[model samples]
Target: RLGSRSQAPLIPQAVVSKYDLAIQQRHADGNIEVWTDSKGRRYAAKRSSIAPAHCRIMVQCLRHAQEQGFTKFARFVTTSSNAPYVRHGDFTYYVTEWVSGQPANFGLPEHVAQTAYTLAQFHEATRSFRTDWKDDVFGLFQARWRDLRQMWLGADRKREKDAFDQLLLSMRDELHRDAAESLALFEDRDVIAYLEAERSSGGWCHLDVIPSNCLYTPQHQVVLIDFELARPAPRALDMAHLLRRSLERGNWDGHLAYACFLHFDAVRNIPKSEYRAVEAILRFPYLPWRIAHARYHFAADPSQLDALQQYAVQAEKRQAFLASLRQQVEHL
Candidate 1:
């Protein structure tokens, strides 16, 4: 129900015929198909909505890393065109040596540490392609806060509001107030200069390296997938994002925070300045802001209204978890 194959594109026959592809699973963007070649060798086909040029660059980058001895990335299988990708309608798809693994267990401390370490290895492997693809890290944060403010103001002016609307209005104020304090702290420190320095020496980041984007094998190995958003950026952003994701499921655990940083730093030492930047990002009230933004922008269907209460409850937990998270990271 979350995705539609009608809108989902297909893999080219020229490519699929050679491998005898059959759909094993369907994803929002495309499908994951299992294929068998004449020699009975198996492969995995990934059909997704990646731009042609972007897809090529990702393939090239990963191949380069593999040749340099990094094997955790899914290896691309060339098409009959002797290229890494094949075109299907407006999208592109690729084949890779099948990776048999399971989704990571985020609740496990060892798995969390493994994920962080794997990310560190990924960054180290793909560090050289620092190009013009820069992310305005602080700029994005400021823009999100600004948008939340506008939506909050719009909701406040509503003539007749439901209980959910009123609750959101109240939460908007809390999020805005907390965000202001963080932004103020951000401006006060030499953090901006520190972040700028870090960016100047930027590395590749798997911007979407959540648990679902990773696989853990029975061999105690970690494999990273979904490189569509991969680009050169300050590595701190990836670290911050990963840490934020870990806390989203439950209450803050200081030990987990410690292990997350410890595991990553063991591979590539993270500086105090970068740590501060991560702390600043953690302080921002992102979850509540996203829910509020969506509710005001979209029509209030039953599903939307039903989710409002659940998200509101999580927003309250986010406040407490974030407070504890900031404290725990300070010592790390």
Candidate 2:
């Protein structure tokens, strides 16, 4: 409807012909082609060079969820050819039903609670997962312990020092200290055991679950979108990630975080025992390690180093939140 008889929106005819979809250029934004059928049913033809691999996982997840009768996500639609996706140029496009809803407000307790419940539901449904994907792992997430150690031990070895590196290594001692404490807690809790259990139990982490990715329906259901970052990591990582998002938004209030955990456990129980693991994961110095990791690889990109330096400033205050959270967990 965005065009007249002559002017046409550039959409994949292969996708259109295969799925009988009409592209909605008016609704077009970002990397997706919003489209509809004759009956005006909305869909998104998501374009990704990272697809097929991502698409294969998408199909498996949807089909797996469907089998479990977990209808909380926007289901992927197959083409007339019964394929999960179609190819157009360097991109692969897959269609998922457009979930019509509002983006979640992290400030709202109800929205936050519902998001927690839905995430637990997702993890519970996807338990006992099996996949051959090696790249799909959260590399930065998994290596924080070592990276923190590296940042600390090698802080004295830097030669080509810049303002960013100057600021980064200057605080390596503090970050390393924090890492050791967190790692000690982590070792005692053996979160590896917890995560390994979830891996074989079919649990997959959405990895990028946040307020924006979750849509609030009129019926009060939280529909989680954006599975592109979906990976099979510890389900706890998603919960921790979501909690970090909430904590960052809620001023890292322990009360709000514990309440959020309660809502999640109601649907899919996070073992009360693993609260220690959760605490250690949050305190794991992920941000500092990420800064150091980037500095290691992309030192030439001084352009982003300003952003890095600014982010680097947040290291201690962020830890202050984690420290408060640890106290909260102990009381809980």
Candidate 3:
């Protein structure tokens, strides 16, 4: 998607006058880019490849955020000259108010910590929205496993097929159990306890929340963007996923990793609560998907057997951590 340069349908004269004009490299997501007009105002513009059904969700979510008293985002400017949904060629386009700031990897410690708090605030603000609890964030994890399983079953590679069968055998009892029981394995709880709690507080959860989604401004204010994956689920699961993402540098680099953790710890200061956060990370949705991804990478290149062997050796260094994680978390 990054290499694909698509066009917005049309550029309104009002937008062109309010912001300085220039074409720049798109953001990492590849669907959006920054625009500047003659007056030096900056804005973000995004174009969808196919026609969009509800671009209004982006605006509504931002508005929902603003009405809740959080300015962690650049407010959508309403100036007609400043805010026009342009139609450029075949693409539908819209611009967002832009606050000049650093992304996660470039921001200072205060900004990073503020980001964690802002995420907490955002979660707190949006919990009232109704959503289906059963949808699995686009079924990201489970769907991938099925896709790979289909591929493996059709392949002629006997050794790889045998290895797949071996892993499948290992996962039988763990992965094949009843749904409620399986979800409970992600943490130290029984299925009944998990289900009762899940049905009650599973209001609004950010299926995906990571550093790249956050922004930092001149006064150390933190902001967020993109809520397409936001939905309903266990609240702890969302926070936990954020925790794992922070640790693994899923969005930001290692430089700010521990500082962000300390920031989160400071907010959720209660030891038990922070511990819950850790547990949640261990059980974050779709464990099977991540494991299958790693497994598939290994299978795709049997010539990399030596490399995989070396990786296992390195993994041995943290055998205790791995074992503890395995005991407390569901299989990936």
The top-ranked prediction according to TM-score is 1
Q: Identify the superior model by TM-score, candidate 2 or candidate 3.
A: 2
Per residue, candidate 1 scores C-alpha lDDT tens digits across 1-332 of 55653554445565575433453433233247666655556676787788888887888777766765667777787754577777766657787776777777665667677778777777777766645553465667788888888876887898988776777676766777778866865774567876676566655788887776777877777788888888876777778777776766544555566667888899788877777777788777776666666777765555555556666667667676667665655776
Candidate no. 3 TM-score = 0.59
Q: After superposition, how far is residue 25 of candidate 2 from its true place, in Å?
A: 4.1
Q: Which pairs clash in the backbone of model 1? A: none
lDDT of 3 by residue, 29-115 (tens): 334566655566667765543334444555565567568765666555433454434445665566667766666642455655677
Clashing pairs in 2: 126-202, 127-201, 127-202, 127-203, 128-201, 128-202, 129-202
TM-scores for candidates 1 onward, in order: 0.84, 0.77, 0.59
- Candidate 2 deviant stretches above 4 angstroms: 1-10, 22-27, 36-41, 50-57, 129-170, 210-212, 229-231, 300-317
Task: Summing lDDT over every window of 10 consecutive residues in candidate 2, give the lowest-scoring window.
Answer: 132-141
Q: Considering TM-score, which of the candidate structures 1 and 2 is the better prediction for this target?
A: 1
- C-alpha lDDT score of every prediction, in listed order: 0.70, 0.69, 0.49
Clashes of each: 0, 7, 16
For model 1, the run of ten residues with the poorest summed lDDT = 21-30
Best by lDDT: 1
Alpha-carbon RMSD, candidate 2: 5.5
Better of 1 and 3 by lDDT: 1
Model 1 clash count equals 0
Q: lDDT tens digits, residues 69-141, model 2?
A: 6778888888887888888787777778888888887767777788887887777777665543542123344
